[PDB]
Design a protein around this ligand. Structure first.
Ligand code: GSH
Ligand code: GSH
Ligand code: VC3
Lengths: 198, 198
């Protein structure tokens, strides 16, 4: 199929889709827009938000809805309906936390203060929950990589930009990040992707 | 399997799971806890949030992850891979909006203000988006009911508690709620369920 991904020049909410395409060896057009192109694109969209994915001309929206759709019938989704449930739940837990951050806050001091509170209290709590959920296992769910591990690596990459020592007491979570990054298709993608802060 | 759902005594985030059990005619224990006993149960949970669904000796978490699991390979899932994506995307759009509400805000004045703002300034646009998206179809996705229709009915019910006039300019959206409420299994549940505000 002919896939076209639209988002800003940023990892952000589209990166999970980008990892999935890379891993599954699926070709797509990685369309990145500048704000000036947005108002016009936005007006054409039923829900006015990005990312969107156009599949043979038909437009899909909601990044995680799209990610799940792409992993359909692949090992990345989870090996059973039960494992798929754990995969979806871990993804949701991570998304719930990332949504706490005031990404669009215009008062720089308020943004800094909120980021700091979230990274001092909430983040370490979640890291301990994640660390114990993973235990000494290889991947978050089951015995092979799933898009939940991808989402962990992606979310943590963003959190580390703001609190570099966040995983300093969580070597098992660091090890999970390294295992995802070392998957050849992922390693390749990380090397060639546009470099952006977020 | 033996199902035990744990949540507060309210529709809230567990209601979608309750409609799914009803529709699929699956018996389950509808466990509802009092606030005072929550801190104790929270301490034993891998991620400290509810609802949770215990299936056999397994605990599951994240309401939508559970809803997705229970509807997989049932007539409540989309009819094609792409329809499944649209089902997930409409649910996520509704969820994104409902999760913006500060349900756990202890400062009453701050809470009411945020509620009023979201209901007055944001809710009408979501209604516009959903109305346009539905167009003239019978259901949100495809030619038959999906759990996205259930979620729409559930979310709108709560929104109408706070803003009764929300659907005055959207008869097609009122018609959809009525269609969902007309489904025998759903009608039966709406009639017999504990009648709570939220
Ligand atoms: N949960 C949705 C969120 C969509 C969303 O909030 N997108 C943002 C960009 S990260 C957006 O388009 N907001 C700016 C705007 O629409 O004007 C998803 O993952 O796709
Ligand atoms: N995204 C999660 C949200 C779960 C959630 O935030 N539940 C609330 C109750 S509505 C909760 O457990 N909060 C009480 C607490 O965290 O102490 C889901 O859909 O299940
Ligand atoms: O009254 N509540 O406490 C409450 C909490 C959450 C929701 C919710 C979140 C996403 N969908 N529905 C609805 C009601």
């Amino acid at each position: 199929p002919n896939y076209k991904l639209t988002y800003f020049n940023m990892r952000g909410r589209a990166e999970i889709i980008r990892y999935i395409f890379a891993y599954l060896d699926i070709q797509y057009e990685d369309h990145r827009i500048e704000q000036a192109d947005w108002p016009e694109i936005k007006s054409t969209l039923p829900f006015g938000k990005i990312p969107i994915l156009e599949v043979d001309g038909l437009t899909l929206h909601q990044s995680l809805a799209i990610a799940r759709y792409l992993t359909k019938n692949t090992d990345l989704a989870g090996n059973t309906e039960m494992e798929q449930c754990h995969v979806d739940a871990i993804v949701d837990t991570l998304d719930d936390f990332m949504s706490c951050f005031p990404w669009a806050e215009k008062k720089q001091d308020v943004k800094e203060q909120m980021f700091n509170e979230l990274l001092t209290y909430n983040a370490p709590h979640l890291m301990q929950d994640l660390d114990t959920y993973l235990g000494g296992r290889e991947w978050l769910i089951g015995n092979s990589v799933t898009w939940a591990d991808f989402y962990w690596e992606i979310c943590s990459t963003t959190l580390l930009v703001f609190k570099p020592d966040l995983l300093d007491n969580h070597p098992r979570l660091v090890t999970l990040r390294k295992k995802v990054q070392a998957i050849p298709a992922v390693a390749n993608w990380i090397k060639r992707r546009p470099q952006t802060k977020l």
